[PDB]
Structure formats: C-alpha cells, structure tokens
Design a protein around this motif. Structure first.
Motif, mmCIF file in Angstrom:
data_model
loop_
_atom_site.group_PDB
_atom_site.id
_atom_site.type_symbol
_atom_site.label_atom_id
_atom_site.label_comp_id
_atom_site.label_asym_id
_atom_site.label_seq_id
_atom_site.Cartn_x
_atom_site.Cartn_y
_atom_site.Cartn_z
ATOM 1 N N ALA A 1 -14.891 13.444 14.942
ATOM 2 C CA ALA A 1 -16.136 13.239 15.690
ATOM 3 C C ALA A 1 -16.912 14.552 15.815
ATOM 4 C CB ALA A 1 -15.829 12.674 17.072
ATOM 5 N N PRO A 2 -18.262 14.498 15.733
ATOM 6 C CA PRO A 2 -19.123 13.307 15.681
ATOM 7 C C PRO A 2 -19.373 12.726 14.284
ATOM 8 C CG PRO A 2 -20.483 15.262 15.840
ATOM 9 C CD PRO A 2 -19.059 15.739 15.690
ATOM 10 N N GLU B 1 -17.155 11.385 11.788
ATOM 11 C CA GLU B 1 -16.467 10.106 11.565
ATOM 12 C C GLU B 1 -15.312 9.919 12.540
ATOM 13 O OE1 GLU B 1 -16.898 11.892 8.226
ATOM 14 O OE2 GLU B 1 -15.640 13.407 9.188
ATOM 15 N N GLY C 1 -20.152 7.326 13.208
ATOM 16 C CA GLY C 1 -20.419 8.756 13.091
ATOM 17 C C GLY C 1 -21.629 9.127 12.256
ATOM 18 N N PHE C 2 -21.954 10.420 12.258
ATOM 19 C CA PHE C 2 -23.082 10.960 11.495
ATOM 20 C C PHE C 2 -22.905 10.739 9.993
ATOM 21 C CE2 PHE C 2 -24.896 14.347 8.921
ATOM 22 C CZ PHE C 2 -26.234 14.356 9.306
ATOM 23 N N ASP D 1 -23.324 7.002 9.195
ATOM 24 C CA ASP D 1 -24.731 6.599 9.187
ATOM 25 C C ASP D 1 -25.496 7.178 7.999
ATOM 26 O OD1 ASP D 1 -24.260 5.143 11.500
ATOM 27 O OD2 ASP D 1 -25.133 6.649 12.834
ATOM 28 N N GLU E 1 -18.532 19.000 20.312
ATOM 29 C CA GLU E 1 -18.485 17.578 20.658
ATOM 30 C C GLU E 1 -17.322 17.268 21.605
ATOM 31 O OE1 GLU E 1 -20.516 15.031 20.133
ATOM 32 O OE2 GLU E 1 -19.474 13.243 19.398
ATOM 33 N N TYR F 1 -29.766 12.577 12.412
ATOM 34 C CA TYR F 1 -29.434 13.883 12.978
ATOM 35 C C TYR F 1 -29.744 13.936 14.479
ATOM 36 C CZ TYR F 1 -28.945 18.993 13.286
ATOM 37 O OH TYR F 1 -28.563 20.267 13.638
ATOM 38 N N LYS G 1 -29.948 11.380 16.491
ATOM 39 C CA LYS G 1 -29.087 10.409 17.173
ATOM 40 C C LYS G 1 -27.763 11.036 17.610
ATOM 41 C CE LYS G 1 -26.330 6.259 16.310
ATOM 42 N NZ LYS G 1 -25.995 5.172 15.348
ATOM 43 N N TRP G 2 -27.180 11.845 16.732
ATOM 44 C CA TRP G 2 -25.861 12.418 16.970
ATOM 45 C C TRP G 2 -25.893 13.804 17.613
ATOM 46 C CZ3 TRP G 2 -22.064 9.076 16.954
ATOM 47 C CH2 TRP G 2 -22.183 7.916 16.169
ATOM 48 N N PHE G 3 -27.024 14.496 17.497
ATOM 49 C CA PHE G 3 -27.113 15.882 17.963
ATOM 50 C C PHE G 3 -28.278 16.162 18.924
ATOM 51 C CE2 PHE G 3 -24.842 15.768 13.904
ATOM 52 C CZ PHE G 3 -23.647 16.400 14.238
#
Ligand SMILES: N[C@@H](Cc1c[nH]c[nH+]1)C(=O)O
Length: 231
Positions: free
Chosen positions: A12-13, A15, A24-25, A28, A161, A216, A218-220
């Motif tokens: 993570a983040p 997978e 995960g990034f 996606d 993370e 990017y 979305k996850w960061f």
C-alpha cells in the motif's frame, strides 16, 4: 487470450487487499493503461519472489508491483517508461535514536527480500546477519513493531502511507537524501516482450489525457510533478 499481470498486493498504497479485492494506485493505473492499449488482462496476486520467477519463465506476461527500474533487473527483464518517482527511507519507532542511515550501523535492519531497500542496506554495511529479509514489506514493518528489527528500509510513499494510516503504532519516517538516490517505478516485462511498446504508448495516453493525474490525486491528495516522468 488475456494478458497475465502479476502483483504482490502487500505494498500500500500501490497494491493491497481491501475486503478481498486488490486495490491501489498501481491497480488503477494498470486498468487505465491496459484499456488504453486495448488489452484484456487478468490481475494475479502472486508474491514478490514468485512474480520475478514467473516473469523469467514467461508464465506471467506483465508486472506492476511498485517495481523500481534498475540495471540489475534489466539483465532479465524489460521495463516500461517510468510512471512514478520514489526513494528509500528509514522507518523506525518514534523513540528511535536514528537520524540518518549511518546511525543504522550495528543495528538490525528489516528489508523485503530482493528489493532496492535491501540493496541500499547491503551497500552501507555489507552483507551480514543484521539484515533481515522478509517476503513482504508488511512483515518487515511487523518485525519493527515487535522489536525484531531496529529499522526498516522501504519505499517512501509506502512508509508515509503506513505512518499516516497507523498513528497508534507511533512510527516515524527518517529521510536521508544524501544516502538514498532517486528511484523510478516501471511496469515490468519478460525479455523482448511485445507488450512493452503497447504499454509505453498507453501510459502516454493516460498521462496526456489527464487520467494519470486523477489517479495520482486519488491516492496522494496532491498534483503530481509530471516532469519526474521525463527524467
Ligand atoms: N521499489 C522497490 C521496493 C518494492 C517494490 N515492491 C516491493 N518492494 C523495489 O522494486 O525493489
């Protein structure tokens, strides 16, 4: 015939398993890239060391597992154009005396096996007993929480993370840009793969259309500096 994509969903983040599903990034981004390349695919959670073995045997066609591009991996595998910049950091308990990588001397370092974090730890203090290799980064961090290791060397966004997601563990990220060099993630392929060129072109489409940036964010939670991908 679908493209067999392998990943180690314990990172993570990028997978990881969430309610029995791989998210995960990288998950996606892969979806975005493959659909832009027009390739039906299957994502397999296979493991870190099995994945690299499977890529050499060609049983797995493609890999996205937060894998750092290195010349040592270029021996057996091909890489896509970079899609992420990272660096090794030092993860410790908040009460640790560690201020830099040289403070890790004589201490025990938990790394995931066959990674750039392992390489970095072995670069400083050579190969030896107090470098503890684990199959996943998750387990390496678990050996840090219980005191089995004094420090963990892993990728920065993963460490950040874990600190963000787990404040009750009271861990801190120690950065050493003097000792740790810039790293770039790439999608991995068996040698002379015909998918590489299709993925490179699809990645560009994903970046150009603004698709990469949405993933990017979305996850960061921030805009990427896309100039990191043209280094
Ligand atoms: N990015 C590092 C660490 C890592 C990625 N995935 C698991 N570990 C590597 O590819 O070696």
């Amino acid at each position: 015939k679908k493209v067999v994509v392998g990943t180690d969903a314990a990172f993570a983040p990028f997978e990881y398993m969430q309610k029995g599903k791989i998210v995960g990034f990288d998950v996606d981004l892969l979806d975005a890239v493959m659909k832009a390349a027009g390739l039906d695919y299957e994502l397999k959670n296979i493991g870190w060391d099995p994945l690299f073995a499977s890529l050499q045997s060609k049983e797995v066609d493609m890999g996205i597992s937060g894998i750092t591009i290195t010349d040592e991996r270029k021996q057996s595998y091909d890489f896509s154009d970079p899609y992420f910049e990272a660096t090794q950091v030092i993860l410790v308990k908040q009460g640790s005396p560690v201020k830099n990588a040289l403070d890790l001397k004589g201490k025990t370092i938990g790394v995931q096996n066959a990674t750039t974090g392992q390489e970095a730890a072995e670069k400083l203090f050579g190969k030896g007993p107090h470098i503890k290799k684990f199959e996943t980064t998750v387990v390496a961090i678990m050996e840090l929480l219980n005191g089995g290791v004094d420090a963990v060397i892993t990728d920065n966004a993963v460490a950040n993370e874990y600190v963000k997601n787990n404040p009750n563990k009271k861990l801190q990220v120690i950065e050493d840009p003097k000792n740790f060099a810039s790293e770039y993630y790439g999608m991995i392929f068996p040698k002379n793969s015909e998918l590489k060129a299709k993925v490179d072109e699809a990645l560009k489409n994903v970046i150009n259309s603004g698709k990469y940036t949405e993933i990017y964010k979305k996850w960061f939670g921030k805009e990427p500096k896309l100039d990191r991908l043209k280094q």
